[PDB]
């Protein structure tokens, strides 16, 4: 909204007036405050939202700004006469008046803001339910059944684990959005934030390795016998988690809970200068957990197209050939679904971080949160893709229901 901005500019210029050498600074600050004040007076504060413009509460609210403006005018009169310190003193009085008579009306979130929290809570809940149940089923199926122990399925186990973990955090994140605070302590704050990064890194790294596995199964059938075993897949899974802990561990450490503006926030506290390391991390995340892995996957499939399209006998049997081909198609589809789901938020974050966009615009904030939600949706979508695209997962699904 405009009100919160106008209110921020009032505060910011009061601080300018406190530490000011000369009357020009004071006059300029006061004049800006007056424009903000007049603008603020035209708003409907969240606490009086959908109340009549001519209601007692609205009249009183507007009246408070007539008083502020009157005081800004007196302070400005003084500043124009050269009387800096008296103007500074007069401005200290605004702060009192403002707090004593206008403060009450500001504070709350708007209905639109609460609407957003409810919609997010709705989506996160649906995602959590389908995602958590779905991936726990996949993991149970892979362990429980002999026929499931395959190199490709061990990789899938790793995706399901990352997705199970990621979706388990959503109810806590939902609660935060509804309550506008973090009531779960620091340890669970550390857990939720680091799990977010683990999901992103372990997932794409695993999809990269599934693409490489497929590349080897198709273009190097003889060497594939050497490389493509369940045990080695498991080994690569572990390596993926170890490697991803290069980002995961720092995040555990930097994740803290702090009291701020009457709430507890769970946040990442980067070392000084915070803005610099925050931005280094974001560009690193974007490159090493999205762009570079996608190049590798693209290359792997590019080289596979030469053999997949321009041949007929890949293996020495009909059953194996079609089995090698559909598993390869599944991996591409799972990869595709991952990129579609994650690309929007990843682009948004870079734009949000680097470009001067209106970060308080209702539409931008709605779109952003939709894009964040789409990233999590990937986790609930994947179990359904395995059921749709793979013979043994369909049979495992049907045996359950």
């Amino acid at each position: 909204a405009d009100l919160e901005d106008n209110w921020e500019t009032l505060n910011d210029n009061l601080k300018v007036i406190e530490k000011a050498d000369n009357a020009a600074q004071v006059k300029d600050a006061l004049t800006k405050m007056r424009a903000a004040a007049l603008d603020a007076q035209k708003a409907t504060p969240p606490k009086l939202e959908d109340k009549s413009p001519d209601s007692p509460e609205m009249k009183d609210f507007r009246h408070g700004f007539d008083i502020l403006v009157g005081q800004i005018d007196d302070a400005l009169k003084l500043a124009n006469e050269g009387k800096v310190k008296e103007a500074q003193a007069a401005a200290e009085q605004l702060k009192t008046t403002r707090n004593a008579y206008i403060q009450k009306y500001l504070g709350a979130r708007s209905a639109s803001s609460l609407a957003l929290a409810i919609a997010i809570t709705a989506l996160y809940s649906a995602v959590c339910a389908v995602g958590l149940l779905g991936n726990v089923l996949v993991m149970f199926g892979i362990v429980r059944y002999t026929k499931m122990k395959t190199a490709t399925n061990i990789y899938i186990f790793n995706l399901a684990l990352a997705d199970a973990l990621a979706t388990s955090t959503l109810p806590f994140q939902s609660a935060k959005y509804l309550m506008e605070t973090w009531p779960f302590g620091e340890l669970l704050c550390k857990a939720v934030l680091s799990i977010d990064y683990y999901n992103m890194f372990t997932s794409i790294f695993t999809l990269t390795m599934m693409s490489v596995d497929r590349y080897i199964a198709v273009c190097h059938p003889v060497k594939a016998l050497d490389f493509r075993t369940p045990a080695k897949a498991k080994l690569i899974n572990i390596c993926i988690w170890v490697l991803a802990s290069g980002v995961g561990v720092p995040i555990m450490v930097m994740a803290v809970t702090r009291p701020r503006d009457g709430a507890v926030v769970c946040m990442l506290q980067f070392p000084s200068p915070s803005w610099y390391w925050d931005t280094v991390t974001k560009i690193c995340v974007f490159l090493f957990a999205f762009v570079v892995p996608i190049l590798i996957i693209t290359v792997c499939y590019g080289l596979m197209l030469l053999r997949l399209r321009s041949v007929r006998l890949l293996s020495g049997s009909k059953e194996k050939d079609r089995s090698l081909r559909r598993i390869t198609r599944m991996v591409l589809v799972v990869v595709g679904a991952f990129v579609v789901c994650w690309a929007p938020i990843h682009i948004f974050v870079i734009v949000w971080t680097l470009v001067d966009i209106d970060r308080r615009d209702p539409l931008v904030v709605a779109a952003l949160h939709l894009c964040i939600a789409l990233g999590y949706a990937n986790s609930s979508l994947n179990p359904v893709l395995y059921a749709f695209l793979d013979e043994n997962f369909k049979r495992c699904f049907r045996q359950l229901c």
Partner: peptide
Amino acid sequence: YXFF
């Protein structure tokens, strides 16, 4: 992803 992402957070403050």
